[PDB]
Write a protein that binds this ligand. Structure first.
Ligand code: 0TL
Ligand code: CA
Length: 181
């Protein structure tokens, strides 16, 4: 006569967290990673990922919202510039590049954008793509497409966690299983 409060333990260096295992579909729960509100976890993840980012990387690119904190802290740690691909058109965007994000929960709607200034910062550079979690990979594919459309090359993919499928072409800190409902 009560609801589940099950958790999944992660450890980034010696930052330990208990991720709540929460329902997201008829038949599925995930260990939910919350960087918002957690400076210690955010900085530890960004430090660990920067340790894995080679000197070849020119620029960091992350999506709104899952790459905001990580890209900022990676850039602050490494000295590399970074770019956020936005979810909405903003008035400072002239001639934006746009890609659809493949998504199972609600197709068609999801989009990522680069203004021509963001794009001018990516053109011709080696890019590390970063996002907090990679699950289906739709977000990651859309970022690949945006980076290609802007003239850059994805050299590395950085994430705190893969989820569901394991991804050996990805630099991740851990793997999160998907749980039943
Ligand atoms: N366990 C999770 N804890 C936090 N956030 C998660 C988790 N699993 C997926 N996410 C998010 C949001 O739902 O999914 C995006 C990628 O989804 P995709 O690879 O299919 O395109 C990420 O940016 C991230 O925000
Ligand atoms: Ca900082």
């Amino acid at each position: 006569g009560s609801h589940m409060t099950l958790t999944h333990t992660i450890t980034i260096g010696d930052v330990r967290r208990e991720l709540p295992i929460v329902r997201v579909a008829d038949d599925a729960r995930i260990a939910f990673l919350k960087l918002y509100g957690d400076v210690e976890l955010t900085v530890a993840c960004a430090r660990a990922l920067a340790g894995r980012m080679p000197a070849d990387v020119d620029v960091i690119v992350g999506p709104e919202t899952g790459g905001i904190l990580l890209a900022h802290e990676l850039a602050e740690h490494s000295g590399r510039p970074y770019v956020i691909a936005r979810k909405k058109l903003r008035p400072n965007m002239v001639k934006p590049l746009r890609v659809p994000v493949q998504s199972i929960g609600t197709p068609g709607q999801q989009e990522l954008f680069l203004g021509e200034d963001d794009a001018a910062l990516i053109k011709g550079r080696r890019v590390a793509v970063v996002d907090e979690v990679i699950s289906s990979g739709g977000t990651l594919k859309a970022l690949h497409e945006l980076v290609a459309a802007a003239g850059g090359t994805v050299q590395q993919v950085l994430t705190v966690a893969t989820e569901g499928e394991r991804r050996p072409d990805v630099e991740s800190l851990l793997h999160l299983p998907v749980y039943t409902d």
